[PDB]
Amino acid sequence: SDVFHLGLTKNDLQGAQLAIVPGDPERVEKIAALMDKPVKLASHREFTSWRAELDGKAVIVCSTGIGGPSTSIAVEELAQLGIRTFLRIGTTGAIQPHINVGDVLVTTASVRLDGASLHFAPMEFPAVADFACTTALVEAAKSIGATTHVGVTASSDTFYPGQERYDTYSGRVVRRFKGSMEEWQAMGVMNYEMESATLLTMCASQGLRAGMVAGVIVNRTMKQTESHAVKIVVEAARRLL
Amino acid sequence: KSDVFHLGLTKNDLQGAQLAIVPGDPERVEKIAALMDKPVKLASHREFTSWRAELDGKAVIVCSTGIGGPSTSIAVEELAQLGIRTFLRIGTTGAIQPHINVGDVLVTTASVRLDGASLHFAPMEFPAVADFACTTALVEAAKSIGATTHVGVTASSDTFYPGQERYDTYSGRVVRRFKGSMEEWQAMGVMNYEMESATLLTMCASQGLRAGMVAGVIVNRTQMKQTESHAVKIVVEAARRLL
Amino acid sequence: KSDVFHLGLTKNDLQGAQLAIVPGDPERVEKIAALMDKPVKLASHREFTSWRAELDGKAVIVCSTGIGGPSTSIAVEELAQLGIRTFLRIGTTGAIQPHINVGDVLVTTASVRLDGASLHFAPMEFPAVADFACTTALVEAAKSIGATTHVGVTASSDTFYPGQERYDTYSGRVVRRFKGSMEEWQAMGVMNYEMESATLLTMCASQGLRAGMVAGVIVNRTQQTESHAVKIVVEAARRLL
Amino acid sequence: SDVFHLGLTKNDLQGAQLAIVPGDPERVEKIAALMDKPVKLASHREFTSWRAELDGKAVIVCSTGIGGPSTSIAVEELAQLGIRTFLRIGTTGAIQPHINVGDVLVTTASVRLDGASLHFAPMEFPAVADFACTTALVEAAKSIGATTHVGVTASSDTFYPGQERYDTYSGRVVRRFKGSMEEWQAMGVMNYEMESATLLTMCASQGLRAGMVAGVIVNRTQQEIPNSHAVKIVVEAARRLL
Amino acid sequence: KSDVFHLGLTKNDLQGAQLAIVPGDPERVEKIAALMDKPVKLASHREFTSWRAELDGKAVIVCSTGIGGPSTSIAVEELAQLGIRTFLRIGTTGAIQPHINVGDVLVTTASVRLDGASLHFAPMEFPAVADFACTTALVEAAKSIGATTHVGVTASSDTFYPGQERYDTYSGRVVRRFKGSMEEWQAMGVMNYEMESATLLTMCASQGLRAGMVAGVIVNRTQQESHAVKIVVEAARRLL
Amino acid sequence: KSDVFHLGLTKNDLQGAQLAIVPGDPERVEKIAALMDKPVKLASHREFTSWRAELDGKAVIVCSTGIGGPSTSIAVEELAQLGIRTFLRIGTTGAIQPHINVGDVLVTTASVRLDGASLHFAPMEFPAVADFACTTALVEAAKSIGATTHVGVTASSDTFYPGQERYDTYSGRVVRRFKGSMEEWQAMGVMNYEMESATLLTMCASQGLRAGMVAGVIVNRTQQEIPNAETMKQTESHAVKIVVEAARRLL
Ligand SMILES: O=c1ccn2c(n1)O[C@@H]1[C@H](O)[C@@H](CO)O[C@H]12
Ligand SMILES: O=c1ccn2c(n1)O[C@@H]1[C@H](O)[C@@H](CO)O[C@H]12
């Protein structure tokens, strides 16, 4: 292995320059099986990687695990192997009343409620997606005729307090996040997730292209939906090779 | 009679306009409006000079913002109060990337928040991101003109001198925060420096207003008639796709 | 033709002036200059309109700064380059203290830095403090014409609306940082709100330049003026040559 | 399931109140095997959980995955399931020249170079470990004679720039972290890892007890990347905390 | 005269002392020293009153720090310059937990840094953590002496009033940052308020010096706005 | 009897005094009081020693604050509860500007907040500015006595060592924030370093209280030579006489 965590070598990628990065390692094979010649490459910790082919071009599918920290490792090591385009596909919960389950959300930029993004750029720097990737995702969503929302996403380092969930062990939410969801809602924020701030910041600050698409599973205010998101990320990827 | 505190305009004055092209200099407002139908002057107070024109039968506003986010925040706010929901920033800029040559066009996806006004609308964590439809229209319009375009991040500074790490000043000093900052932005891929986008993009993206920005490169510190016109044609053409 | 990038001025144009009165509105430059000897127009570029006059045989400059710290930082810097060492800001303002009435004169000793430009010259810990000689001249000048004067702190905001906690706006909302802020400033003794002093005072105090500010109260939120404020700033200038 | 991610019910715990939480899901079974009646419970995403018995008391072993975000989910849902004491067992990069690979490091408190800890307490709050847990870990290491070092640990949200590793795609480190390792080193910080700040903060600020121990796999004063004593210790320590 | 700027002490004055007990009140220095052998007054400048004493045949220093991290930072630094490597702070404190009673002894593992001096030694991310050996000696000493002991986090404030959300003041107002802070600390398990541990603990932990802290409860905020001493001495005994 | 928790004073003790001179060292209190009429010691608790005296027939308080903003905040707060509305801090300091000589007098208009207590009264954006009347009284008093005066900004640090970028210490290191800071403050025109003004000026300016600050330069961080053993003594008397003279104008 040429990289410490993934257990992958440059040869394993077979020239691949684009990678689809879901958070769950169990979703890796499912995405790869949607393309040609899917082949499992490795599995270490939360990182499960597969190689497939799209229109004769090698593409990688590698899980990131939950959170910016594990995500930063996968992105960094994939970049070291040659990947220059990263497309995250995920599941999410909207915070806008009009966003229904099954809807597709394409992130233009993210509210940085994480810590890893700061390890690549100061807070003043925008966690913005790559224009081409975002365009590819929006056009792919339209292609399959999905109800799509394009906008800002709040990317939190936590699933509970950071997303202002009170049904917890302590039921306490620290001052910083007390009342935050309503704030985000009034600011037009679409949803909450836990990896985009890190992904988008480390990519945009190092000349790497990154996009983000997610299917709405729940609304604070899967099968078929996740299927949609997955089809969309694969079709978008096809336009970025 | 005016509905707002600074622009000296009434909603009636806009005639249903919902989109405004917002250059910084009031002496460029008429030139921009002149490219459209029925260009009529509306008002001028301070650095806020406004004109109304028509694009494919739809009224459009061209209003200057002045220099800086503070001045820009007043114009955008009051225009929003008059009915404007889409803002297209047009300008000329330098560049901090070697591969960007004079005459190229820059379309900004998001900005580095090196201002103060943006924080009066959203915390620093919030992205000073451009609207997707506006950015798309600008990129498409630029492409139709065959212009060499660069799409990326811009650094929006509250100062023309230290915030852009200029040492050719009275003090010849640059505060710690900005010492060595230009090479950092360059390494992060930042395309250029300008002084109003962080405020514009942040206040719009956090208030349900659509915003985008396009600029013509007139100078490159690492190394303007025609360049300005192209940018202007692009912003007007983009507005056409956003009406 | 020009020794500076924006003002359109040369050192010759100043004729040795070391003092500049800096109102925000270009429309007030001529009026202020009119109170002195041999007033003459110099230049006008963007929001920067300058005039030169004479007081007691010494050349004086009156130059507008426009609205906000960004344009103000450009005017101050370029005037400093031309030889200006003392800056006196004159303006009209809206008080936030119940007992500061319209017609009253405010002399700022220091400002609350709710701007962004000041930070491009000194870290937040540094005081946006006015120079003592300037403050003294303004106070004494105000006394000479019998104005009801208030000497103290001013809140300097990068915005006219949210930063001054105004809700009569399009969104009708004020970001967390500023929600409930006016009441706090009031309880802290802050006299008023304006938008240029934090930048002016911080950049001058941290670069060996002298600066002060006086304003006439023309309105009060907790419920001829301009001519007197102008008289005061010109009278104060005389004492600083 | 009583929780959203772990796929467990309180019954699966069998009265367990202490959880040994490694980062690597492949280390869970290895840890459970050193105890009685080891039984696999579930495996979803990066959260692999096993149950074991120590001195006749049910004990849980659950992986957290890499980083504070993943860790905060595991800790929270395990807390909802009834766990009150957490003992993290991990691997780490030493930053002091005298620390050898294989040495066991017990963390008293962590430098919060993460983001999730801020979701439980402001930066002013110390990411301090529980005294009983730290005592048990030190006492357990003393009982098996392992080379042990007790002190502060720097817990980073990244493996690369936050730990000032330059052997990367960009080869650059943001201003905030340039020269940071030398600084921590001069301050006595023993090592780098990526979960303790979050773990210790969320536990100390919510009435939960937490201990932190890790084995050295690389010495940063020499290289950025390398070419069971800590485990024995974490298990022994748990025995003292039942 | 003196090898240091403020304390007015010479290295020879310490007679080899490597541990110092540091109370806040200079008036308690003599009393604490009186609990050991051969107590000799050394100096008295500002709020820095110091005595030397002997414990199990080893020289020990008792030096007041005055109130606050700034004053404390000077005492600690200059004592370190003279050879002290272990600092045990003993103080009075106000509990913010209802189960903690007046007369109870508190041992601090780490402190909430609500001060400014700690930032002059380490950024805010760094923990104001106590030394493990020192904390252990304090806990073990508490058992020996016999006292209702509580071991946990302490909030160290740069002020006695607003920073501890006290309203019995001239203005009667508390700045935004501290409005409602006490119940926040309380919900987080913080045991008490005091004003020197954040600075002491941080500057020692980040400079290779051992520090520990114990305090006696003299009031409970959930109600109103000698053990400890015997414990710090017995603890010093275990650390010589 | 005591109306306050630390000072051990009662409003009666003040005899109507509304102004207080606040030096840092409790041993200096008696010295400053000696420049006025009928000085009498009031109390002494911890680093808080207080005396009452008469100035032009009006009661005035002299009370030490101790070192740093924390103890200073207690003294100022409790003296305020007792009725004091004006505070004049007098100190001895080390300058950081080459042109400021030993023996010179410094009057602080505002301070760089390198402390922590000031934040317990106002957020960092708020200026640690001195009251205009007090500053005017100090400047005019310096002129009456006839000293070489400098009027400007002061860096108020929570530490005597790293915060003032001193390397002659046990660890010999200075944390990142203060590394190269003295040079930055010098270029910004900061006159000196001291340890109580940020707290004192901020807590007073944000609570309707008047505060002034004057100090005598006993040493210069940029010069080689160091004042005999009478570094303070003569220079200290200079500043002391100036703060008393200034007080007379604020009664
Ligand atoms: O409330 C929700 C619902 C779903 N997600 C979320 N918040 O952020 C989560 C991570 O991206 C990932 C971790 O479960 O799933 C995203
Ligand atoms: O330098 C090091 C060495 C080891 N670890 C670390 N930093 O944090 C890492 C993750 O928890 C996990 C995967 O790297 O191992 C921990």
Give yes or no for a contact between F47 and E71, defined as CB atoms under 8 angstroms apart. yes
Question: What distance lies between CA B108 and its chain's CA centroid?
Answer: 9
Picking from F103, F65, F48, the residue whose alpha carbon sits closest to that of residue F237 is F103
Count the Cβ atoms, other than its own, within 10 Å of residue E99: 10
Please tell me which residue of chain E has the smallest CA distance to F181: E120
Give yes or no for a contact between F251 and F37, defined as CB atoms under 8 angstroms apart. no
Sole residue written with tokens 């020996």: E144
> CB distance F77–E117 less than 8 Å?
no
Residue located nearest, by CA, to atom 4 of ligand 2: D92
> Is D77 part of the annotated catalytic residue set?
yes
CA dist D87 to A142, D64, D84, Å? 49, 11, 10
CA dist A165 to A211, D215, E162, E189, Å? 27, 35, 31, 20
Residues of A in Cβ contact (< 8 Å) with E184: 174-175
CATH of the domain at C60: 3.40.50.1580
Give the tokens for residue B139.
């990129």
Domain residue limits at E37: 1-240
Count the Cβ atoms, other than its own, within 10 Å of residue D53: 16
Whether B and E touch, i.e. at least 3 CB pairs below 8 A, reads as no
Pairing between β-strand C58-63 and β-strand C19-21 as defined by DSSP bridges: parallel
CA distance A163 to chain D (A): 9
Residues of B in Cβ contact (< 8 Å) with F184: 175-176
Give the tokens for residue C22.
């800096």
CA dist F143 to C143, F29, F147, F236, F238, Å? 22, 24, 6, 16, 12
Classify residue A241 by burial, with Cβ atoms within 10 Å: 0-12, 13-18, 19+.
middle
Residue B124 DSSP label: T
Give the whole-angstrom CA distance, residue A147 versus residue F38.
87
Give the tokens for residue B100.
């960007």
Give the tokens for residue A42.
């490795």
Tell me, letter by letter, the H, E, C secondary structure of F180-246: CHHHHHHHCCCCEEECCHHHHHHHHHCCCCEEEEEEEEEEECCCCCCCCCCHHHHHHHHHHHHHHHH
Give the residue before each break in chain B, using a C-to-N cut-off of over 2.5 angstroms; say none if it is continuous. Answer: 223
Residues of A in Cβ contact (< 8 Å) with B208: 188
Angle at E156 between CA E152 and CA E159, to 5 degrees: 150
C-alpha of residue D156 to centroid of ligand 2, in Å: 9
Give the tokens for residue F6.
């630390």
Partnered with residue D213 across adjacent β-strands are D89, D106
- Measured over the CA atoms of residue C199, residue C202, residue C207 and residue C211, the dihedral's sign is positive
Alpha helices in chain A (DSSP H): 10-13, 28-32, 68-81, 131-143, 180-186, 196-204, 223-238
> Is A165 part of the annotated catalytic residue set?
yes
Structural domain count, chain B: 1
Classify residue E90 by burial, with Cβ atoms within 10 Å: 0-12, 13-18, 19+.
buried
Coil, strand or helix: which one is D151?
strand
**Residue-wise DSSP of A32-80:** HTTSEEEEEEEEETTEEEEEEEETTEEEEEE---SSHHHHHHHHHHHHH
**Residue-wise DSSP of F68-133:** SHHHHHHHHHHHHHHT--EEEEEEEEEE-STT--TT-EEEEEEEEEESSGGGGTS-TTS-EEPPHH
Check pocket membership of D163 for ligand 2, CB cut-off 6 A. Answer: yes
Picking from F222, B34, A198, the residue whose alpha carbon sits closest to that of residue D115 is A198
Question: What distance lies between CA C46 and its chain's CA centroid?
Answer: 18
Give the tokens for residue A29.
């094979």
Give the whole-angstrom CA distance, residue E66 versus residue E70.
9
Give yes or no for a contact between B59 and B14, defined as CB atoms under 8 angstroms apart. yes
Question: What are the φ/ψ torsions at residue C210 (nearest 5 degrees)?
Answer: -95, 135
Partnered with residue F143 across adjacent β-strands are none
Which of A108, A131, A187 is closest, CB to CB, to B126? A187
First to last CA, chain A: 25
Q: Which residues, 6+ apart, have CB-to-CB distance to D80 below 8 Å?
A: A168, A169, D2, D3
Angle at D211 between CA D206 and CA D213, to 5 degrees: 145
Question: What are the φ/ψ torsions at residue D163 (nearest 5 degrees)?
Answer: -110, 15
Q: Largest Cα–Cα distance of chain A, in whole Å?
A: 53
Give the tokens for residue E174.
């508390």
Give the tokens for residue D66.
């890499």
Picking from F182, D219, A134, the residue whose alpha carbon sits closest to that of residue B135 is A134
Give the whole-angstrom CA distance, residue B72 versus residue B78.
10
- Does E120 lie at the interface with F, CB-CB under 8 angstroms? yes
> CB distance A175–E184 less than 8 Å?
yes
CA distance E109 to chain F (A): 22
Question: What distance lies between CA C77 and its chain's CA centroid?
Answer: 15
| Rg, chain F, Cα only | 17
Check pocket membership of A194 for ligand 1, CB cut-off 6 A. Answer: yes
> Which run of H or E residues covers position E70?
helix E69-81
- Contacting B residues, span 24-83, partner chain A, CB-CB under 8 Å: none
Give the tokens for residue F128.
């640690």
- Does F176 lie at the interface with D, CB-CB under 8 angstroms? yes
Picking from D188, D227, D228, the residue whose alpha carbon sits closest to that of residue D104 is D228
Residues of C in Cβ contact (< 8 Å) with B66: 46-47, 66-68, 71
E124, E184, E185, best to mutate vs chain A, most A CBs in 10 Å: E184
C-alpha of residue C124 to centroid of ligand 2, in Å: 36
Beta strands in C81-240 (DSSP E): 86-95, 105-114, 128-129, 149-157, 192-194, 210-220
> Which amino acid makes up residue F99?
H
> Which amino acid makes up residue B119?
L
Give yes or no for a contact between D212 and D199, defined as CB atoms under 8 angstroms apart. yes
Q: Is A175 left (phi over 0), alpha (psi -120 to 50) or beta?
A: alpha
Classify residue B191 by burial, with Cβ atoms within 10 Å: 0-12, 13-18, 19+.
buried
Please tell me chain B's helix, strand, coil percentages from 3-state DSSP, rounded to the nearest 5: 35, 25, 40
Give the whole-angstrom CA distance, residue F103 versus residue F146.
12
Q: Please indicate the experimental technique that yielded this structure.
A: X-ray
Q: How many residues does chain F have?
A: 251
Q: How many residues does chain A have?
A: 241
Give yes or no for a contact between E113 and E128, defined as CB atoms under 8 angstroms apart. yes
Give the tokens for residue B39.
């260009």
Give the whole-angstrom CA distance, residue C196 versus residue C69.
5
Give the whole-angstrom CA distance, residue F82 versus residue F80.
5
> Is A119 part of the annotated catalytic residue set?
no
